């Protein structure tokens, strides 16, 4: 052969990401996403399937990894609400269903060290900083801008409890690995690819109310390097919807 297993090319729609350092690709729970069958249909109206127009790699915002930084999370599908025709279809349709290819990108030279956990947590319900309080929307998501974790227990009013070590939901962070995960350990690979299929208890759902899963990026070993060897290393999260289909068409709105 002439193949290496460190090079991979994922082409989806009119968008191709290449990577020359990676370690395999994790297919969430062994199952590849696919369209709803006629044995699991509930809706009677004919679905639209926009295929190529709504499946393609949407590059979301990229935050800078620093030595002191504690971690970041984004909530899907909520994050994609301003991304092109995905956003539009989601805005004009009551019900939506789709899987997603999450591809986290980062890189560094040989004289850097540091290791990030990349994990897709389905159904992450989160606490509240004030334990008599109740969290509200704006502290759960900022859309496509990353929500930061904190390493200080105290937080504002309607703050979400986000002390790193309890993952913001009252479970020891070290056990998060039970959900589909990879690690970008700088020295080996430099990207993660998790193909997350649709997991929900009901066949399709409303894209605004429900948040299917949260992408958490937590640095377990801090970024470090010796003096004068670059100081800016961003982390870019690129995500592509797969097999997106929508039922129930009506006027645009939230309420």
């Amino acid at each position: 052969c002439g193949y290496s297993d460190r090079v991979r090319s994922i082409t989806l729609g009119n968008s191709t990401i290449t990577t020359q350092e990676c370690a395999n690709v994790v297919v969430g729970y062994g199952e590849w996403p696919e369209y709803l069958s006629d044995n699991e249909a509930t809706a009677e109206d004919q679905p639209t399937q926009p295929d190529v127009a709504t499946c393609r790699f949407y590059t979301l915002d990229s935050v800078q990894w620093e030595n002191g930084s504690p971690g970041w999370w984004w909530k899907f599908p909520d994050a994609l609400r301003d991304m092109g025709l995905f956003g539009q279809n989601m805005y004009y349709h009551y019900l939506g269903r789709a899987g997603y290819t999450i591809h986290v990108q980062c890189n560094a030279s040989k004289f850097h060290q540091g290791c990030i956990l990349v994990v897709c947590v389905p159904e992450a319900e989160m606490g509240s900083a004030q334990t008599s309080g109740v969290v509200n929307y704006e502290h759960i998501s900022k859309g496509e801008i990353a929500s930061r974790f904190t390493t200080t227990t105290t937080a504002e009013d309607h703050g979400v409890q986000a002390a790193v070590w309890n993952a913001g939901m009252g479970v020891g962070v070290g056990n998060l690995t039970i959900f589909p995960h990879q690690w970008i350990n700088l020295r080996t690979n430099n990207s993660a690819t998790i193909v997350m299929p649709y997991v929900n208890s009901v066949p399709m759902d409303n894209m605004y109310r429900h948040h299917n899963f949260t992408l958490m990026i937590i640095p377990f070993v801090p970024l470090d390097f010796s003096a004068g060897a670059s100081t800016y290393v961003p982390i870019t999260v690129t995500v592509a919807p797969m097999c997106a289909e929508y039922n129930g068409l009506r006027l645009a709105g939230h309420q």
């Binding site: 370690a23 395999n24 690709v25 994790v26 729970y29 039970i178």
Partner: protein, 61 residues
């Protein structure tokens, strides 16, 4: 219409004892707990890979 099935029994030095069960109700909900069924499949959790990994070969090559 009785059903016959084998009871849990340990190993022995180098067998089968049956019991009888009959359902008396019209709804499957009323049936006894299904405590015998030991099937499992770690696969989905322990190796959720796309490309098969052979144990004896290096992981990255």
């Amino acid at each position: 219409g009785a059903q016959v099935s084998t009871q849990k029994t340990g190993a022995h030095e180098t067998s089968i004892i049956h019991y009888t069960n009959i359902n008396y109700y019209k709804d499957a909900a009323s049936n006894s707990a299904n405590r015998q069924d030991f099937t499992q499949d770690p696969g989905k959790f322990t190796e959720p890979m796309k490309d098969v990994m052979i144990k004896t070969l290096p992981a990255l090559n």
